[PDB]
Structure formats: C-alpha cells, structure tokens
C-alpha cells in the first residue's frame, strides 16, 4: 500500500508515493535525484508532527515511524539545514546556489537575518539582476520594481523613503551589474549575505547557572553564547577547536573545553526536545567542518 507524499523546495512542488517501510534516506535520495542536486550534504527534510511541531526527518529511520502529521499526502519541505563556511568554494551547481539564494533571501526579507539598510539595497540589487537580467532603459522603465518585494520590513520602517525612492537606489545598483550572469548574481547575493552576523546561525533560548536568559547559537564553526537582547555579537565563543566534548543531560547542556584552566560551561534548555535539536545541529555542523579538512 503506497504512501503519498508531497515535497516542496524553495521553488518546486514534488509528488512521490513511498512504500510502508521507506526510510527518510530513500525519500531524501528520490528528492535530490529528481532535482539533480549532487551537493546534498547541506540539506534535509522538514515535516510537522501530530503535536504540530516542526521537525527534521531522520534519514536512518522509516518515514512511517516518525509521527509525521497524519494526512494524504504527507507534507515535507526540502531545505538547507547546514550552511557552507563560504559559498564560493562550496556551491558549484546552479540548483544548489539557487536553493540557498532563495532560502537566504526569504529569511532576509522576513527579517529573520538582520541586515543594514545599505546592505539590503545592494542585496536587492543582485536579486533584481538575477530576476530581470541586465537593466534595459527600453524595457525596465521606472516602476518596473513596483510589484517586487525587495527590502525587509524593518528597513522600510526605519527609513521613511517611498517605495519609488527605494527602487531608485536599487535601480542605480542594478544598472552597474550589466553583464552579470543570473547564477553569478545569486552567488554575489550570497557572498554578501554570508558575512551577516546572523547568517547561518541556529538560535535557541537557554539560561546559564544564574538563571540569566541567553541564546545559544549553533553554526558551521561551533557554538556561541549571546546575551538575550543581542543576537549579533557573541558574549562568548566556543570554536570546535576549543571544544573537548559536548553532552546534555535531559535539560542540562555541558561544554567541556580542551583547555586545562578553563572550567566547564553549563547551560539549561527548556525542553529535552530543544537539547536534542541542539546536539543534532552540533553533530552535523562539526561533521561537515571536518570533511572540509580531511574527508
């Protein structure tokens, strides 16, 4: 008895039917095969459980054995779970560059990743070059960007310019990108976005031994602790190279530093589900970190 499933990438909707004992890995492989993605190590499948919680699909476990929200077809989102240390030397395929571009641009536009107004304009500039191609005074007449969402709401609200005025600045940059290929435009966007403080960071609310509210940041290079009201600059950093090991006991999270002097660091997460999520991102990120070196 086949099981109907739907998988959506940033710009595509895929329809599959799997058997009862299909594993996440088998579903995953069918997805990347369909869109011709070979740079698969960054991606994963997101689903919603019966309790309405977003979760990443375990690839080693059967799809049917993971409490995916009951429905026909089952619904999954194909998304990048991990980010490259540098897009330039890691994303070679157009499909991959496109998926990261679209996912990152969505997060920037939704104010997910903080972005200075000036940078938002430059970023929008590459997105327009990617979408419209070379600026052509004959076809791209004033107002040609009126129907495009190009800047995050936060930017629009801090600077009271009219849409026309924003478009004017965006257009001036657009004109300067003539000759830039669609794929190259997307990569330029990413090269800029990847230098943003909040780019590629998974934040989790935690508390330290003093009960102070903080954020745990997990990214490609290790872990960071942020003060509750500042997610841009780490309060303290824990690069992989300074980490002996990492473990969690239910809600307790401990970071044993390689160093002799430096003592251990304990942090508390609200739910065990959170700690499991953190450990998983820590494992995956570190793994990719080491592949960039030895494997």
């Amino acid at each position: 008895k086949p099981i109907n499933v739907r998988v959506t990438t940033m710009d595509a909707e895929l329809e599959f039917a799997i058997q009862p004992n299909t594993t996440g890995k088998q579903l995953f492989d069918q997805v990347v095969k369909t869109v011709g993605l070979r740079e698969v190590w960054f991606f994963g499948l997101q689903y919603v459980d019966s309790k309405g919680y977003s979760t990443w699909l375990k690839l080693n476990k059967k799809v049917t054995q993971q409490d995916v929200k009951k429905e026909n077809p089952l619904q999954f989102k194909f998304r990048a779970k991990f980010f490259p240390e540098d897009v330039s030397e890691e994303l070679i395929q157009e499909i991959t560059q496109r998926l990261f571009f679209l996912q990152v641009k969505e997060a920037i536009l939704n104010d997910e990743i903080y972005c200075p107004p000036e940078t938002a304009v430059l970023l929008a500039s590459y997105a327009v070059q990617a979408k419209y191609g070379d600026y052509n005074k004959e076809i791209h007449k004033p107002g040609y960007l009126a129907n495009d969402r190009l800047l995050p709401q936060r930017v629009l609200e801090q600077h009271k310019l009219t849409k026309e005025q924003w478009e004017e600045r965006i257009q001036n940059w657009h004109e300067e990108h003539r000759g830039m290929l669609r794929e190259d435009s997307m990569m330029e966007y990413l090269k800029i976005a990847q230098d943003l403080e909040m780019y590629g960071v998974n934040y989790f609310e935690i508390k330290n031994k003093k009960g102070t509210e903080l954020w745990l940041g997990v990214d490609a290079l290790g872990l960071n602790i942020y003060e509750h009201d500042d997610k841009l600059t780490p309060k303290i950093g824990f690069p992989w190279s300074e980490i002996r090991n990492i473990s969690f006991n239910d809600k307790k999270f401990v970071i044993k530093p390689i160093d002799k002097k430096a003592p251990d660091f304990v942090f508390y997460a609200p739910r065990l589900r959170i700690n499991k999520r953190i450990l998983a991102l820590c494992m995956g990120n570190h793994e990719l970190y080491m592949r960039r070196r030895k494997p």
């Binding site: 992989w240 190279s241 980490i243 090991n245 473990s247 969690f248 006991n249 390689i258 065990l272 450990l279």
Partner: peptide
C-alpha cells in the same frame, strides 16, 4: 536523556 559528543582530544 543522556548523549555525549566528542569534538577533539
């Protein structure tokens, strides 16, 4: 639950 993850050493 209890889970450990070796990073270095």
């Amino acid at each position: 639950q209890k889970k450990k993850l070796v990073i270095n050493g």
